[PDB]
Amino acid sequence: PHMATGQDRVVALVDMDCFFVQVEQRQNPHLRNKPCAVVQYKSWKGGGIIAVSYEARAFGVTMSMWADDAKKLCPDLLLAQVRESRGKANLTKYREASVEVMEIMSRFAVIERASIDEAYVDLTSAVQERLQKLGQPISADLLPSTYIEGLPQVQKEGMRKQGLFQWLDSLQIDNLTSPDLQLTVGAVIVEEMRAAIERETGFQCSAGISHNKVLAKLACGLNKPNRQTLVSHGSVPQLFSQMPIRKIRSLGGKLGASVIEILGIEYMGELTQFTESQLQSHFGEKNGSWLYAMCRGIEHDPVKPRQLPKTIGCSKNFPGKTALATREQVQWWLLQLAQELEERLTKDRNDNDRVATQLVVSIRVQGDKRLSSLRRCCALTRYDAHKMSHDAFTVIKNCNTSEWSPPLTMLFLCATKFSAS
DNA sequence: TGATGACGCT
DNA sequence: AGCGTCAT
Ligand SMILES: Nc1ccn([C@H]2C[C@H](O)[C@@H](COP(=O)(O)OP(=O)(O)OP(=O)(O)O)O2)c(=O)n1
Ligand SMILES: [Ca+2]
Ligand SMILES: [Ca+2]
């Protein structure tokens, strides 16, 4: 009676399907329902693919594939190019499409912007309200695109409905504090949210509904595209019993590899065999407690009330022979970046009633193994591109070993530390 | 041959 | 503060 079960909140994660592709398909109907991809920089191997329609994925086309290589798998692949301004990729169209979706989501609940195409939603309050509206049963008709993970327990839609039926058939609708009922009502609301997003933007999305952010995110990916998935507390032991550790958000990197290496396990469920102290011993007090709870389906990270980015940045690589070797080059490109940055900052100030107060300048030198050879901050007191680019140079001036030596393979300008205005 | 953006550590 | 990790 004193063991927490992490069933206190209803949390959703809404993620747009093949997002940059949908933005380009809305604009150009010729791309709709076709194997297509979004690329940046046409000149090297046809350009780098950064988003892929589900039709193209069926041919094996992936992110981070050169377009020329993708065409070997999928000869009729259609392409849309990222806009280029001031000599660099410009992502404005996708950021603006993002604002369309985020503003719609914000009508339903306060959201946390987690990326350009996804947000978490805390629906706990909304669910309580809808529950008061309700002791009536919940019809399957209200969950037309919802999967219940773990159920049923020979066509795709047939399986979905059978699982949904088993779920609804055993719900206790007379209990307003039932976690399973709360999740179900959550899923009804997310059906409504996803309907509004598609009606008002044209964009389809997937979603996960569970009791916390990590499970919601995991759920979202289980049935994509254009579907949503409910992961109940009860579904966790079976789900985690064969779930590779790397699939869980934040464990896809070196920490996750060390969990696998040090403990000699493969699946998230196997973590339950360790005491909290054992896990803290290996991975630190914070990670240890987090893992101990998370492998039990429990996580407390709040949905933060933030739908605007906290930083506004401009970045460009200069690979191989294109590395910047003269001061005229370095200053010209700092200026190009500063000009895009000023543009976005001025728009931000008018839209969002805030001003950035710190400019961060980051570079990479040719032979450096680190992604950043220098990261330095200075004051950002005026939205002026020439001043920002001049300040950036001043701050990286002493890096030159010299004519710029070694040549620079990356420049980065980032506006940070916003204050109300 | 990429362009971002959040958060943790000392 | 500057660096790193993780991700999208
Ligand atoms: N390494 C990456 C990953 C993504 N994106 C951009 C392109 C994507 O369209 C968008 C959202 O990324 P997702 O990882 O959510 O992938 P998609 O939305 O493209 O596909 P899915 O339907 O699998 O979510 O962000 C990017 O520029 N670089
Ligand atoms: Ca997506
Ligand atoms: Ca995403």
**CATH number of the domain within which A75 lies:** 3.40.1170.60
What CATH number should be reported for the domain holding residue A325? 3.30.1490.100
| Interatomic CA distance for residues A47 and A65, integer angstroms | 9
Output the distance from A379 CA to C6 C1' rounded to whole Å. Answer: 28
Strand-pairing partners, residue A80, are A38
CA A16 / ligand 3 centre spacing (Å): 7
Buried b (16+ CB within 10 A) or exposed e, A255-279: ebeebbeebeeeebbbbeebeeeeb
Q: Same structural domain for residues A49 and A106?
A: no
CB A49 within 8 A of CB A69: no
Could you give the CA distance from residue A78 to residue A35 in angstroms, rounded to a whole number?
6
Q: Shortest CA–C1' contact from A91: which nucleotide?
A: B3
Is A12 within 8 Å of A121 (Cβ atoms)?
Answer: yes
Whether A121 and A218 map to the same domain: the answer is: yes
Nearest ligand atom owner, CA of A224: 1
CA atoms within 13 A on the CB side of A367: 3
Q: Which ligand is nearest to the CA of A51?
A: 1
- Domain boundary (A52, A87, A122) is at A87
Counting the structural domains of chain A, the total is: 4
**CB proximity list for A341: less than 8 A, separation 6 or greater:** A312, A313, A314, A385, A388, A413, A415
A264/A180 same-domain check: no
Question: For strand A228-230 and strand A146-148, is the pairing parallel, antiparallel, or unpaired?
Answer: parallel
Of A45, A94, A84, residue with least CA distance to A68 = A45
Same domain, A124 and A140: yes
Which ligand minimizes its atom distance to the CA of A115? Answer: 3
- How far apart CA A397 and CA A375 sit, in angstroms, is 12
H helix or E strand, kind and range, residue A264? none
Return contacts of A392-400, CB within 8 angstroms, 24+ apart: A392/A334, A392/A338, A392/A359, A392/A361, A393/A330, A393/A331, A393/A334, A395/A361, A396/A361, A396/A363, A399/A363, A399/A365, A399/A373, A399/A374, A400/A327
Q: Tell whether omega for the bond before A237 is within 30 degrees of 0, i.e. cis.
A: no
- Rounded Cα distance between A135 and A173, Å, is 6
CA atom of A115 to C1′ atom of B4, Å: 10
CATH assignment at residue A235: 3.30.70.270
- Residue A348: helix, strand or coil by DSSP? helix
Q: Whose CA is nearest to atom 17 of ligand 1?
A: A18
Q: Identify residue A164 by its one-letter amino acid code.
A: L
Write out the DSSP string of A67-98.
HHHHHHH-TT-EEEEPPEETTEE--HHHHHHH
Distance from the alpha carbon of residue A61 to the mean position of ligand 3, in angstroms: 18
- Does residue A206 sit in helix, strand or coil? strand
**Dihedral sign (CA A237, A238, A239, A240):** positive
**Domain shared by A72 and A117, yes or no:** no
CATH code, A285: 1.10.150.20
Resolution of the PDB structure in angstroms: 1.8
Helix/strand/coil for A244 = strand
Residue A99 to residue A95: CA distance in whole angstroms: 6
Q: Are A191 and A12 in contact (CB under 8 A)?
A: no
Q: Which residue is nearest to nucleotide C8 (CA to C1')?
A: A115
* Ligand 1 neighbours by CB, cut-off 6 Å: A 15-20, 50-51, 63, 116-117, 224-225
Task: Report the atom number in ligand 1 closest to the C-alpha of A64.
Answer: 1
A239 shares its domain with A385: no
Please tell me whether residues A317 and A254 are part of one structural domain: no
Is A122 in the same domain as A225? yes
CA of A18 to the centre of ligand 1 (A): 6
- On the question of a cis peptide bond just before residue A35, with omega within 30 degrees of 0, the verdict is no
Amino acid making up residue A144: P
Contacts of A71 (CB under 8 A, 6+ apart): A46, A77
Q: Is A113 helix (H, G, I), strand (E, B) or coil?
A: strand
Which structural domain range is residue A55 located in? 18-87
Q: CA–CA separation, A202 vs A226, rounded Å?
A: 12
**Partners of A415 in the β-ladder:** A312, A359
Give the residues across from A12 on adjacent strands: A121, A209
Distance in Å, CA A416 to ligand 1 centroid:
24
Ligand 1: residue of A13, A14, A20 to mutate (most ligand atoms within 8 A of CB) is: A20
Same domain, A341 and A276: no
Q: How was this structure determined?
A: X-ray
Q: Within this chain, do residues A111 and A228 fall inside the same structural domain, yes or no?
A: yes
Q: Which residues contact A219 (CB under 8 A, 6 or more apart)?
A: A13, A149, A207, A208, A209, A210, A229, A230, A231
CA distance A307 to A278: 37
* A263 and A309 part of one domain: no
Say if residue A271 is in the same domain as residue A364.
no
Q: Which residues of A are catalytic?
A: 118
Residue A312 CA to its chain's centroid (Å): 17
